[PDB]
Amino acid sequence: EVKLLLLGAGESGKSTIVKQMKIIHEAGYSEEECKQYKAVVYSNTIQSIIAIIRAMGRLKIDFGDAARADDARQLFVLAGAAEEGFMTAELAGVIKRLWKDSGVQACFNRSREYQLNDSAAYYLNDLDRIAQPNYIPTQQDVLRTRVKTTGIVETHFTFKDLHFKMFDVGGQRSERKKWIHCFEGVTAIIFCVALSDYDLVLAEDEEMNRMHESMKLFDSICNNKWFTDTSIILFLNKKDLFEEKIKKSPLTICYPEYAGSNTYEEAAAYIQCQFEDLNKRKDTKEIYTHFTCATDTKNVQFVFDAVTDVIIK
Numbered sequence: 001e002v003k004l005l006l007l008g009a010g011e012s013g014k015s016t017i018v019k020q021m022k023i024i025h026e027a028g029y030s031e032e033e034c035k036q037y038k039a040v041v042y043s044n045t046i047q048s049i050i051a052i053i054r055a056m057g058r059l060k061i062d063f064g065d066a067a068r069a070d071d072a073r074q075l076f077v078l079a080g081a082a083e084e085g086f087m088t089a090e091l092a093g094v095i096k097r098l099w100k101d102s103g104v105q106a107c108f109n110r111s112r113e114y115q116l117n118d119s120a121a122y123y124l125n126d127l128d129r130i131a132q133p134n135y136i137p138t139q140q141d142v143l144r145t146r147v148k149t150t151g152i153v154e155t156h157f158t159f160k161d162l163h164f165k166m167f168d169v170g171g172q173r174s175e176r177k178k179w180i181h182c183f184e185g186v187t188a189i190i191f192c193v194a195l196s197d198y199d200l201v202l203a204e205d206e207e208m209n210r211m212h213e214s215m216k217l218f219d220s221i222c223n224n225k226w227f228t229d230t231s232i233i234l235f236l237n238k239k240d241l242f243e244e245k246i247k248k249s250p251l252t253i254c255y256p257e258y259a260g261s262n263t264y265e266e267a268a269a270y271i272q273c274q275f276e277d278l279n280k281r282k283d284t285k286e287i288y289t290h291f292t293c294a295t296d297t298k299n300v301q302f303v304f305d306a307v308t309d310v311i312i313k
Protein backbone atom coordinates (compact mmCIF):
# COMPACT_ATOMS: atom_id res chain seq x y z
CA GLU A 1 0.00 0.00 0.00
CA VAL A 2 1.76 3.12 -1.31
CA LYS A 3 0.41 6.65 -0.89
CA LEU A 4 1.33 9.26 -3.55
CA LEU A 5 0.45 12.97 -3.26
CA LEU A 6 0.28 15.22 -6.36
CA LEU A 7 1.08 18.85 -5.47
CA GLY A 8 1.79 22.04 -7.45
CA ALA A 9 0.24 25.37 -8.49
CA GLY A 10 -2.94 25.62 -10.57
CA GLU A 11 -2.90 24.01 -14.04
CA SER A 12 0.45 22.28 -13.68
CA GLY A 13 -0.84 18.92 -14.93
CA LYS A 14 -1.61 16.98 -11.71
CA SER A 15 -5.08 15.72 -12.72
CA THR A 16 -3.84 14.77 -16.18
CA ILE A 17 -1.19 12.47 -14.61
CA VAL A 18 -4.04 10.80 -12.59
CA LYS A 19 -6.10 10.20 -15.78
CA GLN A 20 -3.13 8.31 -17.30
CA MET A 21 -3.09 5.72 -14.53
CA LYS A 22 -6.52 4.52 -15.79
CA ILE A 23 -5.27 4.18 -19.38
CA ILE A 24 -1.93 2.67 -18.40
CA HIS A 25 -2.89 0.41 -15.52
CA GLU A 26 -6.56 -0.28 -16.29
CA ALA A 27 -8.13 -0.29 -19.75
CA GLY A 28 -8.63 3.37 -20.49
CA TYR A 29 -12.02 4.99 -20.59
CA SER A 30 -15.04 2.98 -21.60
CA GLU A 31 -17.58 4.39 -24.04
CA GLU A 32 -19.93 5.50 -21.25
CA GLU A 33 -17.03 7.30 -19.54
CA CYS A 34 -15.88 8.92 -22.82
CA LYS A 35 -19.41 10.18 -23.45
CA GLN A 36 -19.40 11.84 -19.99
CA TYR A 37 -16.61 14.17 -21.17
CA LYS A 38 -18.43 15.06 -24.40
CA ALA A 39 -20.00 18.14 -22.77
CA VAL A 40 -16.62 19.17 -21.20
CA VAL A 41 -14.95 19.04 -24.63
CA TYR A 42 -17.73 21.34 -26.04
CA SER A 43 -17.72 23.55 -22.97
CA ASN A 44 -13.90 23.84 -23.20
CA THR A 45 -14.03 24.56 -26.94
CA ILE A 46 -16.74 27.26 -26.67
CA GLN A 47 -15.04 28.90 -23.69
CA SER A 48 -11.71 29.09 -25.57
CA ILE A 49 -13.13 30.83 -28.66
CA ILE A 50 -14.98 33.24 -26.35
CA ALA A 51 -11.77 34.01 -24.40
CA ILE A 52 -10.07 35.05 -27.68
CA ILE A 53 -12.99 37.17 -28.94
CA ARG A 54 -13.16 38.69 -25.44
CA ALA A 55 -9.44 39.62 -25.61
CA MET A 56 -9.80 41.22 -29.08
CA GLY A 57 -11.91 43.91 -27.51
CA ARG A 58 -9.58 44.50 -24.64
CA LEU A 59 -6.50 44.64 -26.91
CA LYS A 60 -8.40 46.54 -29.62
CA ILE A 61 -7.75 43.97 -32.40
CA ASP A 62 -9.99 44.08 -35.48
CA PHE A 63 -11.39 41.01 -37.25
CA GLY A 64 -9.64 40.15 -40.52
CA ASP A 65 -12.88 40.01 -42.47
CA ALA A 66 -15.76 42.32 -41.60
CA ALA A 67 -18.26 39.50 -42.01
CA ARG A 68 -16.89 37.79 -38.89
CA ALA A 69 -18.91 40.34 -36.90
CA ASP A 70 -22.24 38.49 -37.67
CA ASP A 71 -20.58 35.16 -36.85
CA ALA A 72 -19.46 36.57 -33.51
CA ARG A 73 -23.11 37.61 -32.85
CA GLN A 74 -24.39 34.21 -33.84
CA LEU A 75 -21.86 32.56 -31.52
CA PHE A 76 -23.51 33.93 -28.35
CA VAL A 77 -26.99 33.20 -29.72
CA LEU A 78 -25.93 29.54 -30.17
CA ALA A 79 -23.31 28.98 -27.41
CA GLY A 80 -25.93 27.65 -24.97
CA ALA A 81 -26.40 24.25 -26.61
CA ALA A 82 -22.71 23.39 -26.49
CA GLU A 83 -22.75 23.45 -22.71
CA GLU A 84 -25.59 20.89 -22.80
CA GLY A 85 -23.50 18.46 -24.84
CA PHE A 86 -24.76 19.58 -28.23
CA MET A 87 -22.90 20.84 -31.30
CA THR A 88 -24.77 21.94 -34.38
CA ALA A 89 -23.26 21.98 -37.86
CA GLU A 90 -24.37 25.60 -37.79
CA LEU A 91 -22.50 26.44 -34.57
CA ALA A 92 -19.53 24.44 -35.82
CA GLY A 93 -19.33 26.55 -39.01
CA VAL A 94 -19.51 29.78 -37.06
CA ILE A 95 -16.60 28.70 -34.80
CA LYS A 96 -14.62 27.43 -37.77
CA ARG A 97 -14.90 30.66 -39.74
CA LEU A 98 -13.99 32.64 -36.61
CA TRP A 99 -10.94 30.46 -35.79
CA LYS A 100 -9.54 30.88 -39.34
CA ASP A 101 -9.85 34.68 -39.29
CA SER A 102 -6.44 36.47 -39.32
CA GLY A 103 -7.47 38.96 -36.63
CA VAL A 104 -8.62 36.09 -34.39
CA GLN A 105 -5.29 34.32 -35.08
CA ALA A 106 -3.26 37.42 -34.30
CA CYS A 107 -5.10 37.61 -30.96
CA PHE A 108 -4.47 33.89 -30.44
CA ASN A 109 -0.76 34.54 -30.80
CA ARG A 110 -0.73 37.05 -27.98
CA SER A 111 -2.37 34.68 -25.47
CA ARG A 112 0.15 35.25 -22.64
CA GLU A 113 -1.54 38.67 -22.49
CA TYR A 114 -4.71 37.05 -21.07
CA GLN A 115 -5.98 33.66 -19.82
CA LEU A 116 -6.44 30.85 -22.37
CA ASN A 117 -6.70 27.02 -22.05
CA ASP A 118 -3.61 25.00 -23.09
CA SER A 119 -5.96 22.86 -25.20
CA ALA A 120 -7.71 25.67 -27.14
CA ALA A 121 -5.83 24.92 -30.41
CA TYR A 122 -6.03 21.15 -29.97
CA TYR A 123 -9.84 21.24 -30.02
CA LEU A 124 -10.32 24.26 -32.25
CA ASN A 125 -7.93 22.70 -34.84
CA ASP A 126 -9.96 19.41 -34.75
CA LEU A 127 -13.46 20.95 -35.09
CA ASP A 128 -14.63 18.79 -37.99
CA ARG A 129 -14.04 15.61 -36.04
CA ILE A 130 -15.38 16.74 -32.66
CA ALA A 131 -18.50 18.28 -34.27
CA GLN A 132 -19.51 15.09 -36.12
CA PRO A 133 -22.96 13.62 -35.46
CA ASN A 134 -22.52 10.75 -33.00
CA TYR A 135 -19.06 11.88 -31.76
CA ILE A 136 -17.58 10.08 -28.69
CA PRO A 137 -14.39 11.64 -27.26
CA THR A 138 -11.14 9.72 -27.78
CA GLN A 139 -8.65 8.84 -25.01
CA GLN A 140 -6.62 11.89 -25.94
CA ASP A 141 -9.71 14.13 -26.02
CA VAL A 142 -10.38 13.13 -22.38
CA LEU A 143 -6.73 13.81 -21.34
CA ARG A 144 -7.00 17.27 -22.94
CA THR A 145 -10.07 18.34 -20.94
CA ARG A 146 -9.72 21.13 -18.44
CA VAL A 147 -11.80 20.75 -15.27
CA LYS A 148 -10.87 22.65 -12.11
CA THR A 149 -9.97 20.51 -9.11
CA THR A 150 -11.29 21.88 -5.81
CA GLY A 151 -11.06 19.61 -2.81
CA ILE A 152 -9.29 16.26 -2.56
CA VAL A 153 -9.56 13.45 -5.15
CA GLU A 154 -8.53 9.94 -4.18
CA THR A 155 -7.75 7.33 -6.81
CA HIS A 156 -6.71 3.69 -6.44
CA PHE A 157 -4.89 1.19 -8.71
CA THR A 158 -2.55 -1.82 -8.63
CA PHE A 159 0.84 -1.70 -10.30
CA LYS A 160 3.68 -4.16 -9.82
CA ASP A 161 1.73 -5.97 -7.07
CA LEU A 162 1.49 -2.72 -5.12
CA HIS A 163 -1.83 -1.11 -4.23
CA PHE A 164 -1.66 2.56 -5.06
CA LYS A 165 -3.64 5.31 -3.39
CA MET A 166 -3.05 8.48 -5.37
CA PHE A 167 -4.08 11.82 -3.88
CA ASP A 168 -4.77 14.95 -5.90
CA VAL A 169 -5.69 18.51 -4.77
CA GLY A 170 -6.33 22.03 -6.19
CA GLY A 171 -3.35 24.36 -6.72
CA GLN A 172 -4.96 27.81 -6.76
CA ARG A 173 -4.06 29.91 -3.73
CA SER A 174 -7.56 29.58 -2.14
CA GLU A 175 -7.21 25.82 -2.31
CA ARG A 176 -3.84 25.52 -0.69
CA LYS A 177 -5.44 25.78 2.75
CA LYS A 178 -6.70 22.24 2.16
CA TRP A 179 -3.32 20.62 1.50
CA ILE A 180 -2.61 19.77 5.18
CA HIS A 181 -5.53 17.30 5.21
CA CYS A 182 -3.47 14.96 2.95
CA PHE A 183 -0.14 15.15 4.81
CA GLU A 184 -0.44 11.85 6.72
CA GLY A 185 1.48 8.71 5.72
CA VAL A 186 2.69 9.99 2.34
CA THR A 187 5.06 7.52 0.68
CA ALA A 188 6.01 9.97 -2.08
CA ILE A 189 5.10 13.45 -3.38
CA ILE A 190 4.96 14.14 -7.12
CA PHE A 191 5.39 17.90 -7.49
CA CYS A 192 4.18 19.05 -10.92
CA VAL A 193 5.53 22.20 -12.58
CA ALA A 194 4.40 23.75 -15.89
CA LEU A 195 7.56 24.67 -17.85
CA SER A 196 5.48 26.85 -20.20
CA ASP A 197 4.42 29.07 -17.25
CA TYR A 198 7.65 31.13 -17.32
CA ASP A 199 6.00 33.99 -19.22
CA LEU A 200 2.47 33.85 -17.75
CA VAL A 201 0.88 35.43 -14.65
CA LEU A 202 -1.46 33.99 -12.02
CA ALA A 203 -5.16 33.76 -12.86
CA GLU A 204 -5.55 34.76 -9.18
CA ASP A 205 -3.06 37.63 -9.58
CA GLU A 206 -1.80 39.45 -12.64
CA GLU A 207 1.14 40.90 -10.73
CA MET A 208 2.66 37.50 -9.91
CA ASN A 209 4.76 35.48 -12.41
CA ARG A 210 3.49 31.90 -12.57
CA MET A 211 6.89 30.17 -12.37
CA HIS A 212 7.97 32.21 -9.34
CA GLU A 213 4.88 31.00 -7.52
CA SER A 214 5.75 27.32 -8.17
CA MET A 215 9.27 27.93 -6.90
CA LYS A 216 7.85 29.37 -3.72
CA LEU A 217 5.69 26.28 -3.33
CA PHE A 218 8.39 23.74 -4.08
CA ASP A 219 10.80 25.47 -1.71
CA SER A 220 8.17 25.16 1.05
CA ILE A 221 7.21 21.52 0.52
CA CYS A 222 10.71 20.26 -0.26
CA ASN A 223 12.26 21.73 2.89
CA ASN A 224 9.33 20.82 5.20
CA LYS A 225 10.85 18.68 7.93
CA TRP A 226 7.52 16.76 8.06
CA PHE A 227 8.50 15.25 4.67
CA THR A 228 12.13 14.45 5.63
CA ASP A 229 11.35 10.81 5.02
CA THR A 230 9.12 11.16 1.97
CA SER A 231 10.55 10.75 -1.56
CA ILE A 232 10.36 14.02 -3.49
CA ILE A 233 9.71 13.51 -7.19
CA LEU A 234 9.74 16.56 -9.49
CA PHE A 235 7.89 16.52 -12.82
CA LEU A 236 8.96 19.39 -15.05
CA ASN A 237 5.76 19.19 -17.07
CA LYS A 238 4.48 20.60 -20.37
CA LYS A 239 7.84 19.91 -22.03
CA ASP A 240 6.02 19.94 -25.40
CA LEU A 241 4.59 23.47 -24.99
CA PHE A 242 7.85 24.73 -23.52
CA GLU A 243 9.72 23.39 -26.57
CA GLU A 244 7.57 25.46 -28.95
CA LYS A 245 7.48 28.54 -26.67
CA ILE A 246 11.22 28.80 -25.88
CA LYS A 247 11.81 29.63 -29.56
CA LYS A 248 9.83 32.87 -29.55
CA SER A 249 9.36 34.11 -25.98
CA PRO A 250 12.41 35.11 -23.92
CA LEU A 251 13.23 33.22 -20.72
CA THR A 252 14.72 36.46 -19.35
CA ILE A 253 11.08 37.36 -18.57
CA CYS A 254 11.28 34.88 -15.66
CA TYR A 255 15.04 34.60 -15.06
CA PRO A 256 16.69 37.97 -15.99
CA GLU A 257 20.22 36.58 -15.67
CA TYR A 258 19.73 33.64 -18.05
CA ALA A 259 22.60 33.91 -20.58
CA GLY A 260 21.80 30.78 -22.64
CA SER A 261 19.99 30.36 -25.94
CA ASN A 262 16.36 30.08 -27.01
CA THR A 263 16.75 26.32 -27.21
CA TYR A 264 14.94 23.53 -25.40
CA GLU A 265 17.90 21.44 -24.06
CA GLU A 266 19.81 24.42 -22.67
CA ALA A 267 16.78 26.33 -21.21
CA ALA A 268 15.29 23.14 -19.71
CA ALA A 269 18.41 22.19 -17.67
CA TYR A 270 18.59 25.79 -16.42
CA ILE A 271 15.03 25.67 -14.97
CA GLN A 272 15.84 22.25 -13.51
CA CYS A 273 18.83 23.76 -11.64
CA GLN A 274 16.75 26.74 -10.47
CA PHE A 275 14.30 24.33 -8.79
CA GLU A 276 16.89 21.83 -7.57
CA ASP A 277 18.78 24.75 -6.03
CA LEU A 278 15.89 25.33 -3.55
CA ASN A 279 16.73 22.07 -1.76
CA LYS A 280 18.49 23.08 1.47
CA ARG A 281 19.80 19.60 2.34
CA LYS A 282 21.34 18.52 -0.95
CA ASP A 283 23.60 16.00 0.84
CA THR A 284 20.83 14.46 2.89
CA LYS A 285 17.89 14.86 0.51
CA GLU A 286 17.44 13.59 -3.05
CA ILE A 287 15.21 15.16 -5.67
CA TYR A 288 14.05 12.85 -8.51
CA THR A 289 13.44 15.00 -11.61
CA HIS A 290 11.67 14.07 -14.85
CA PHE A 291 10.66 16.24 -17.79
CA THR A 292 7.16 15.28 -18.94
CA CYS A 293 4.29 15.66 -21.29
CA ALA A 294 1.29 14.61 -19.17
CA THR A 295 -0.97 14.24 -22.21
CA ASP A 296 1.36 11.71 -23.89
CA THR A 297 0.60 8.22 -22.55
CA LYS A 298 3.86 6.54 -23.65
CA ASN A 299 5.91 9.30 -22.06
CA VAL A 300 4.02 8.99 -18.76
CA GLN A 301 4.26 5.19 -18.87
CA PHE A 302 8.04 5.10 -19.12
CA VAL A 303 8.37 7.84 -16.51
CA PHE A 304 5.97 6.26 -14.04
CA ASP A 305 7.67 2.93 -14.44
CA ALA A 306 11.01 4.50 -13.45
CA VAL A 307 9.45 6.38 -10.53
CA THR A 308 8.04 3.18 -9.00
CA ASP A 309 11.40 1.39 -8.88
CA VAL A 310 12.63 4.40 -6.96
CA ILE A 311 9.65 3.90 -4.65
CA ILE A 312 10.45 0.18 -4.60
CA LYS A 313 13.95 0.99 -3.18
Ligand SMILES: Nc1nc2c(ncn2[C@@H]2O[C@H](COP(=O)(O)OP(=O)(O)O)[C@@H](O)[C@H]2O)c(=O)[nH]1
Pocket (backbone or CB within 6 Å): 008, 009, 010, 011, 012, 013, 014, 015, 016, 017, 117, 118, 119, 143, 144, 145, 146, 147, 148, 149, 171, 192, 237, 238, 239, 240, 241, 292, 293, 294, 295
Ligand atom coordinates in the same frame (compact mmCIF):
# COMPACT_ATOMS: atom_id res chain seq x y z
N1 LIG B 1 -0.20 20.08 -24.20
C1 LIG B 1 -0.08 19.85 -22.93
N2 LIG B 1 -1.11 20.18 -22.14
C2 LIG B 1 -1.13 19.54 -20.92
C3 LIG B 1 -0.10 18.84 -20.34
N3 LIG B 1 -0.41 18.51 -18.98
C4 LIG B 1 -1.68 18.91 -18.90
N4 LIG B 1 -2.18 19.53 -20.04
C5 LIG B 1 -3.38 20.29 -20.24
O1 LIG B 1 -3.32 21.37 -19.31
C6 LIG B 1 -4.64 21.57 -18.65
C7 LIG B 1 -4.53 21.64 -17.12
O2 LIG B 1 -4.13 20.40 -16.46
P1 LIG B 1 -4.78 19.77 -15.16
O3 LIG B 1 -4.33 18.37 -15.15
O4 LIG B 1 -6.29 20.06 -15.10
O5 LIG B 1 -4.00 20.55 -13.98
P2 LIG B 1 -4.15 20.70 -12.39
O6 LIG B 1 -4.87 21.98 -12.32
O7 LIG B 1 -2.77 20.81 -11.95
O8 LIG B 1 -4.80 19.40 -12.06
C8 LIG B 1 -5.58 20.44 -19.12
O9 LIG B 1 -6.43 20.85 -20.19
C9 LIG B 1 -4.53 19.44 -19.74
O10 LIG B 1 -5.04 18.68 -20.84
C10 LIG B 1 1.13 18.67 -21.15
O11 LIG B 1 2.21 18.19 -20.83
N5 LIG B 1 1.01 19.14 -22.45
Ligand code: ALF
Pocket (backbone or CB within 6 Å): 008, 009, 010, 011, 012, 014, 015, 147, 148, 149, 150, 169, 170, 171, 172
Ligand atom coordinates in the same frame (compact mmCIF):
# COMPACT_ATOMS: atom_id res chain seq x y z
F1 ALF C 1 -6.12 24.25 -11.32
AL1 ALF C 1 -5.76 22.60 -10.69
F2 ALF C 1 -6.19 20.97 -10.01
F3 ALF C 1 -4.77 22.94 -9.26
F4 ALF C 1 -7.47 22.65 -11.41
Ligand SMILES: [Mg+2]
Pocket (backbone or CB within 6 Å): 014, 015, 147, 148, 149, 168, 169, 170
Ligand atom coordinates in the same frame (compact mmCIF):
# COMPACT_ATOMS: atom_id res chain seq x y z
MG1 LIG D 1 -6.65 19.15 -10.94
